[PDB]
Amino acid sequence: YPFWAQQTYPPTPREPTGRIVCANCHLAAKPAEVEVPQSVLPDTVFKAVVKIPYDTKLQQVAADGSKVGLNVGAVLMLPEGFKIAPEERIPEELKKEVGDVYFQPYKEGQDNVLLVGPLPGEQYQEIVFPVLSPNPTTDKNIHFGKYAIHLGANRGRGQIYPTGEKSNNNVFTASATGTITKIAKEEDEYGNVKYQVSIQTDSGKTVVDTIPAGPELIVSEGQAVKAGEALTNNPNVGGFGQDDTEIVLQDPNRVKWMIAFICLVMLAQLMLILKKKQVEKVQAAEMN
Amino acid sequence: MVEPLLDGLVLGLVFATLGGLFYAAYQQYKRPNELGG
């Protein structure tokens, strides 16, 4: 959950390497995308689109075991100065495509760093940020230019709780090397099913492995599989992903002059060629 | 750090160039010579 990034990594969701801390608990990797315009003018509302696709007609394991669907969520890192557009500066057309999203700032102040989710995946395969570009003209310390944008997006339950304990949307190795004896499956009048496996043989040993209700079983009975071995199966169909992009907080004048100069240049080119032609005609009289 | 616009200008221009070059190699592999080689 985006807000767990917030609790576990207070100061920022992005490590010096660019990783983004969501990768710490959500260990699968599915693809993720951000689309903004190539350029925006100062002080202008624009649309930043996060994409977080997954096979919609697909289900994941629930915490107790069921088989519900998954939610999506992202952290979007806009450049300094940028922020979510004022409710009132958002045109109807766009308000409608944004939905009931709670853009939530990583920490007080950091309004350009946005957390969002969990939101139901069936509807929010793409999430639309109404963002309002800053104004170099009134904020002396925001400058025109190209800036990075960072995104981390996730769908599906993660693998590790902030407490630090494993979840159930992953696999469970084997406690130690040896042979398998019995596999029981308790069900505490509260704590749902929890198949229990036992090892042993060779150098003593009598350890046990208790595995939550949700993952499969791809183990049989009476086999000697060493310690740390895939005896669970991988339940997880979720995953987390990153994308980066850039946007140019562009100044109209820079463009307007650039145009004027391009026009001067073409004009000047024309004049040279027209000239060449004059010379060609003049040279023609020197042929004879 | 990658750079889509450039990468694209690169290929457009590479192919358009390899192309017009062969086109020119050809236009002359046919109506060639004249002037005296």
């Binding site: - | 889509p4 694209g8 200008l9 358009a16």
Partner: protein
């Protein structure tokens, strides 16, 4: 972010011919 690439590729390629032809046309209309 990669629709920029093909956009640039096509146009960089394409606009040459537009320029080329545009050049030729100028030649016709002048009398070369």
């Amino acid at each position: 972010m990669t629709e920029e690439m093909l956009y640039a590729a096509l146009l960089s390629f394409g606009l040459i011919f537009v320029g080329w032809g545009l050049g030729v046309l100028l030649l016709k209309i002048q009398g070369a």
